[PDB]
Probable thiamine-phosphate pyrophosphorylase
Amino acid sequence: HMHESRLASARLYLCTDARRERGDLAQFAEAALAGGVDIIQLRDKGSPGELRFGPLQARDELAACEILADAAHRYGALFAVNDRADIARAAGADVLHLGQRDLPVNVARQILAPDTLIGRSTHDPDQVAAAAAGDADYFCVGPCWPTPTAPGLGLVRVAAELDKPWFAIGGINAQRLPAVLDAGARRIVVVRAITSADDPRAAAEQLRSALTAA
Amino acid sequence: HMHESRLASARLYLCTDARRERGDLAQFAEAALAGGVDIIQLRDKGSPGELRFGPLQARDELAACEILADAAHRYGALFAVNDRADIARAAGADVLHLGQRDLPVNVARQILAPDTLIGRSTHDPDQVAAAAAGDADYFCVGPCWPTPTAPGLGLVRVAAELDKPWFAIGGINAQRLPAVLDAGARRIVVVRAITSADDPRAAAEQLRSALTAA
């Protein structure tokens, strides 16, 4: 109900790992949410923590979800969980984000409370089309910039010219944001731009200032 | 309904990774099930595949579940999925196995079809007690033998002297089985004993012969 409304206006999306190697998850989320983050997603896959201790177990993941879910709600933000529909339901997440290789949307809709929102990752023009017409509540478009693991801004353009909310994602930061807005994107998902900042709050405020400034 | 009955008599339990680096999952499961395996569980965590390609994504996991679920059912065996209640429901698994650090049982019982069975891993006398008295349909006891990641046979003994089915687990093979039976165990979960055998079928038949021979 209210989630669609909050999502509809969200412009700054953040994905963060559990930060198990730093132990400052709670404080880090405070800083970032106080900085303007509208939606925050727990996505530990490929994190330094996963590299040092291995994949996140459910118990620990639930613990991190409660921290993130509580902070998000105290700031009027949305809390999203990646791939696991069982964790999402146990944690009462506002959003379940499903990439192309994660659980099938229709399967997730069977487990999740009816009001939970679903997001999808898209990487080519066909997925973008399928997402815009699909069941999804929102979708991401990218990676805009290459990573050791890339559609580029051309796909952002395809999304801009087709009303479901969609976000631009992939190596986005302050310096590259002008190009992202140029390609027609009005919402963005960021990671390292805030995740590895010396001052998450400031980093976030800076990004949100440029965002609303369009 | 029928699952409790099949579980009640099961003596040979097998845990196998998706075998992504070998691509012989289907044939491997055939051999093992034709060899007497009563229950087969997909548990990819810490596998060579996870080390080379990373954690198993949901889509791929579901693909492996369908292979294993079909083979198990063709042989009258049970098919179990580890930790993910969402994957279990999507795959129609007969069993969801939950270790101590995985999803909470009560959470899983909310997602799973009512007839799905739940198993639990136990590692000390208190967990064994909690499992024997708990909601669980069965539980495992171990690791009996150390691994680079150990309760030993002393815990198997605690389980034997208290009726819920329980399995002995942890570095079990042909040579060590006599000790396991000595400690009072009547059911076992094996991994490498069959998983890395040159002839899974024969390896399995051999283990089941000693098992029933008690």
